[PDB]
Each structure stands twice: as structure tokens, then as C-alpha cells.
Amino acid sequence: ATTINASSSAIKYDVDVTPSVSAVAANTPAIAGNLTGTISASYNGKTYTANLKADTENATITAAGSTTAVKPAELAAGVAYTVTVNDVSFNFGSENAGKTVTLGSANSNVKFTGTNSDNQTETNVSTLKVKLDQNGVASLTNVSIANVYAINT
């Protein structure tokens, strides 16, 4: 360690997490809104697709003011939504067992909730230092992405 750092986070992270979400607004003569997407991570020049606990009700959309889940069916154009994906994990493989890594995103709107390498819960943080398990898996309580807009088509 030879590098001056007055911030809590290491240089500013070695795993770039990239959620790609597509929100489609409902129509007012009715077209049901939809929301779909995946989560990708870069690590040691490789891309990895995130694994989820469930294929159903594995994420929650919220408008501001309210913790109340918004039906994908009744998304509105022009409203800032936050998407909170639960029980996210990455399988970085057995060759990466036991490595300590920092998760971050080049997207400011992305936050993480999970257990860090010092075994503390952190909520809605821009970076999380985790220890990969004996199989090279990183587990997260959730990943949030803010300022998702449903597009009118």
C-alpha cells in the first residue's frame, strides 16, 4: 500500500457491476407496461452474468416518497423509478476462491447492500469490499439502480 487514500474505498473498485434494465410505460386503448433486464460484472478482463434466487418476484420497483411496489403493468413515462434486485450473486469461479475484491459501478445510480469482508452489513453504498467464498462466489442482499424511466412506445 503506497497510495494516499482519505476515502473509505480502495483504488476505485476492481469489479464493475452493470445492470441493464429496459422499462416500457403503459398506455392511456391500453398497453401494459413491462420491465426486464440482467446484471453483468467485469473482473480480471472477464464478464459474468449475475445469478438470482428466483425467476419470479425477484425485484421491486419504487417511485420516490413511497416504499410501495409499483406493478410493471402500470409504469408511467417521465417518473424516476428505483429498481431493487434481491439475492444477487456472481460466480467468479474456483480459481478466484478467497480473494478480497471491491464491487463498484461506473453508474452513480447503482448501490449495493450486503456483508463486507469485515463481516459488517452495509446498505445502499457505492462500493462494497467482499471476500469471495471457497468457490469464488460473491453474494449480495440486493443491488439498487435509481433513475430508471419507463419509455412510451
From Swiss-Prot:
**Modifications made to the protein after synthesis:** Glycosylated.
Give the location in the cell: Secreted, Cell wall, S-layer
Describe the task this protein carries out: The S-layer is a paracrystalline mono-layered assembly of proteins which coat the surface of bacteria.
Would you tell me the protein name for this molecule? S-layer protein
